[PDB]
Design a protein around this nucleic acid. Structure first.
Ligand SMILES: Nc1ccn([C@H]2CC[C@@H](COP(=O)(O)OP(=O)(O)OP(=O)(O)O)O2)c(=O)n1
Ligand SMILES: [Mg+2]
Ligand SMILES: [Mg+2]
Length: 540
DNA sequence: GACCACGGCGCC
DNA sequence: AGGGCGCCGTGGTC
């Protein structure tokens, strides 16, 4: 019922747009529109009309901003109803769901999307009236962050395409040797990529013991954890596990990545989704650059393909024991706090016990393997699983889960306190007040209930760490532009920067200080920083 | 060509 | 039976 008015609209209008595809760096701006003051303005030519806007206000404001930056236009994203709804409830991840829940319908017409954005913002803003903690997260964190993420996506990252092309040819030959040996041992060829066909060969034909079942379908599992106990006694299992590793890296990273280079920027562009997680974390998609291999030596080779522009250097900064430090602040445990005040390393100490090796002989590989243990046990890891991963008896596993807790009596108390709030209020909170609704805390089925519990007390820890990182990105970004530096990637507790070689050292120091003193806790926040030509070298 | 579910697995 | 994600190939389908 809005009054149709000719383009352009006045400043402050809510924008509506339609893309040919979800990726703003690859999308064709099909239509553009705006709504304000009971009026709607439809653009005759979307691309030309994009120059008329001063800022992007409305649903998916960041995506339009990325496309604008792609066209060399300085169009910063502003108010976004998606961010408002996401703070009220992280379950609000899609424009279709948000519009349905908060008044309206997500259609495929720009004018209607513009009117929807204006209408959704008014209602959602009313929902936040009174929520001062959520409003603070919106004004001081989420909204300015959308501008930062827009620049990150539009900038992209340089990739050594020729290196990955040559690597693909080499790996393919290595894969052929493994699959050929598997088929020989099986006595017949089959689809090794098919876990169903593999299940028959291993358990029915070869008569191997089945120790685990799948979650949904309840089939005999062929996962790495299951095959691990079988790998040393049987050669074929060893071959499969090696086959799994090669094909995983080749089909997910080595092959698709080089084909995603933008023809105009010459770099690889990912998407940093701001409303996709239930804890407040960001996510990376199309392609996912938050899961680039780093553990295995072969996986490290892939990470070397991520390089800096000529004359530039990569700067990688990582928070040290971030969730363990957050836990000390939230729980207020005197003992755990003093641990960080003395400058101890839990990850190193745990690895010392796992491998029976002095603290001065613990390599990075050993230390990273202890992360799964420390974080695992912390968030309710069964004593059975730990004994299976460490190749140690179940009795030694029980003692470790135990010994992990008595040192800090407050941690147990914080968990139980957190769970009660979730059962009563219906949600749990981070340090800054970010919520997550966990209804299954009172489920009558124990497996479902206990699973919901583990989701419940993990959120304040993972979420707070996410809030700290987001706030750090907001403060650091303008400091990089003034130095001619770039913010490329975010990996939960890691920031990948690109700086000129004559300013790389200065950027590294500044970014480190910003991240460490973004929001002081009861324990000091430490950050490890490295500089290199590639991502792997940038992290020592 | 593409949706949906699943197992599986990469990272944090 | 640690938590949080996204993408792979397969299977079944449309
Ligand atoms: N297996 C893992 C690994 C990590 N995390 C969470 C905890 C911290 C956050 C970042 O991960 P890391 O940086 O790898 O762990 P860290 O404690 O920060 O160790 P480091 O000192 O090496 O950074 O992700 C987790 O839940 N489970
Ligand atoms: Mg870290
Ligand atoms: Mg990290």
């Amino acid at each position: 019922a809005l009054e149709e008015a000719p383009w352009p609209p006045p400043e402050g209008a809510f924008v509506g747009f339609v893309l040919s595809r979800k990726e703003p760096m690859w999308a064709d701006l099909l239509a553009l529109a705006a709504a304000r003051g009971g009026r709607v303005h439809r653009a005759p030519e979307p691309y030309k009309a994009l120059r008329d806007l001063k800022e992007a206000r409305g649903l998916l404001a960041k995506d339009l901003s990325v496309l604008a930056l792609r066209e060399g236009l300085g169009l910063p994203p502003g108010d976004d109803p998606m961010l408002l709804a996401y703070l009220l409830d992280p379950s609000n991840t899609t424009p279709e769901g948000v519009a349905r829940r908060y008044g309206g319908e997500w259609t495929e017409e720009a004018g209607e999307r513009a009117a929807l954005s204006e209408r959704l913002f008014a209602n959602l803003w009313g929902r936040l009236e009174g929520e001062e903690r959520l409003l603070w997260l919106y004004r001081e964190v989420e909204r300015p962050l959308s501008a930062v993420l827009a620049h990150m996506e539009a900038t992209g990252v340089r990739l050594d395409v020729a290196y990955l092309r040559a690597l693909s040819l080499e790996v393919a030959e290595e894969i052929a040797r493994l699959e050929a040996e598997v088929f020989r041992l099986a006595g017949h060829p089959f689809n090794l990529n098919s876990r169903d066909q593999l299940e028959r060969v291993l358990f029915d034909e070869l008569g191997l013991p089945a120790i685990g079942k799948t979650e949904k379908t309840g089939k005999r599992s062929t996962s790495a954890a299951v095959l691990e106990a079988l790998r040393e006694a049987h050669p074929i299992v060893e071959k499969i596990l090696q086959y799994r590793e090669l094909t995983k890296l080749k089909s997910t990273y080595i092959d698709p990545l080089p084909d995603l280079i933008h023809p105009r920027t010459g770099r690889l562009h990912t998407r940093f989704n701001q409303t996709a997680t239930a804890t407040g974390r960001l996510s990376s998609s199309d392609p996912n650059l938050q899961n680039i291999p780093v553990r295995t030596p072969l996986g490290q080779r892939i990470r070397r393909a991520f390089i800096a522009e000529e004359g530039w250097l990569l700067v990688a900064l990582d928070y040290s024991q971030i969730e363990l430090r957050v836990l000390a602040h939230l729980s207020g445990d005197e003992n755990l706090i003093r641990v960080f005040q003395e400058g101890r390393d839990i990850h190193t100490e745990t690895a010392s016990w796992m491998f029976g090796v002095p603290r001065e002989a613990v390599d990075p590989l050993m230390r990273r393997a202890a992360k799964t243990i420390n974080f695992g046990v912390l968030y309710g890891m069964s004593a059975h699983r730990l004994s299976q991963e460490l190749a140690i008896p179940y009795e030694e596993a029980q003692a470790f889960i135990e010994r992990y807790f008595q040192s800090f009596p407050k941690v147990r108390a914080w968990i139980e306190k957190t769970l009660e709030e979730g059962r009563r209020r219906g949600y749990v909170e981070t340090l800054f007040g970010r919520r997550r609704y966990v209804p299954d805390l009172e489920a009558r089925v124990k497996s479902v209930r206990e699973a919901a519990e583990r989701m419940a007390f993990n959120m304040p820890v993972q979420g707070t760490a996410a809030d700290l990182m987001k706030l750090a990105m907001v403060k650091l970004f303008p400091r990089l532009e003034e130095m001619g530096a770039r913010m490329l990637l975010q990996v939960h507790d890691e920031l990948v920067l690109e700086a000129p070689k004559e300013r790389a050292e200065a950027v590294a120091r500044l970014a480190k200080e910003v991240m460490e003193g973004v929001y002081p806790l009861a324990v000091p926040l430490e950050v490890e920083v490295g500089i290199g030509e590639d991502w792997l070298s940038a992290k020592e």
